[PDB]
Amino acid sequence: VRSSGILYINIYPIVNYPETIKVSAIPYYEEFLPGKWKKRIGDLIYLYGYGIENEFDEIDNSNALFGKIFRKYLLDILSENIATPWQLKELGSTLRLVKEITENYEFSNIIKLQYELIINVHHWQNTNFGIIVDLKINILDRENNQRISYTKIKDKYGESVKKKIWVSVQAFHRHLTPEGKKYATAMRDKFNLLTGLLKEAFGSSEDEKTFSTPDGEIKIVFKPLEIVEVSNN
Ligand SMILES: [K+]
Ligand SMILES: [K+]
Ligand SMILES: [K+]
């Protein structure tokens, strides 16, 4: 006798995107500063999105080049749609966004806690795209904004601060209640926290969010991808 189930994963799918995009190829010179709206592929740089200046060609999603360009294009568009109070931490092969935790916690005067969303593009079955999103909570010494270990918190501020911060961090991850206890919806709440912070970071007030591009809309659905297996006993 076998079990059946549903798996939710931290991949949020792009359900609509422009299947053809404008590109402009220029010869690759090392002298050109890399940045948003341009991607080197071999001996060419391809401009795309807001990087399109006067002229252009087009590629569609059957082209090998399309995935290479679109992955980067998608993060560049996401980086134009960050909602306050989130801020850009890094845009490279990954997009990282941060928000300071402004909910009350003991010792928030000396220890700063910060959400960090880590966003990577996933590309599968030739034409499917999505974002894989991880969440971290950074623990910072408020007075100097540097990362601080629990060991250093104990050394600098005392054991009582180290213990209260650990409970608060665990509660902000949804591993514990505010009272420092385990609880029956913790694992569900942990995933719902990730989805809710991601929606907030992109200004999403419904399950689906549209982002404008010069090639047409990109639509993401801010629900975890779901995979269902039903066993036949
Ligand atoms: K919060
Ligand atoms: K504070
Ligand atoms: K889904």
Distance 79 CA to ligand 2 centre (A): 28
Domain assignment of residue 118, given as a range: 5-18+84-229
Alpha-carbon gap, residue 147 to 114, rounded angstroms: 11
User: Given the structure tokens 């002229």, which residue do they identify?
Assistant: 55
Does 214 map to a domain? yes
Number of structural domains the chain divides into: 1
Sign of the torsion angle spanned by Cα atoms 124, 63, 71, 42: positive
Give one word for 37, left, alpha or beta, with left for phi > 0 and alpha for psi -120 to 50. Answer: left
Does 55 map to a domain? no
Distance 194 CA to ligand 2 centre (A): 23
C-beta atoms surrounding 148 within 10 Å = 21
List the structure tokens of 67. 């995935």
Does 183 map to a domain? yes
What is the structure's resolution, reported in angstroms to one decimal? 1.4
Bridge partners, residue 225, by sequence: 9
User: Given the structure tokens 């989130």, which residue do they identify?
Assistant: 86
Question: Rounded to 5 degrees, what are φ and ψ at 113?
Answer: -115, 145
Does 58 map to a domain? no
C-beta atoms surrounding 92 within 10 Å = 8
CB 123, CB 67: distance < 8 Å: yes
CB 226, CB 6: distance < 8 Å: yes
Alpha-carbon gap, residue 56 to 27, rounded angstroms: 14
Bridge partners, residue 130, by sequence: 13, 122
Does 180 map to a domain? yes
Does 60 map to a domain? no
Does 34 map to a domain? no
Does 154 map to a domain? yes
Classify 206 as helix, strand or coil: coil
Alpha-carbon gap, residue 103 to 101, rounded angstroms: 6
Sign of the torsion angle spanned by Cα atoms 106, 109, 111, 116: positive
Distance 11 CA to ligand 3 centre (A): 9
Distance 109 CA to ligand 2 centre (A): 4
Alpha-carbon gap, residue 15 to 56, rounded angstroms: 26
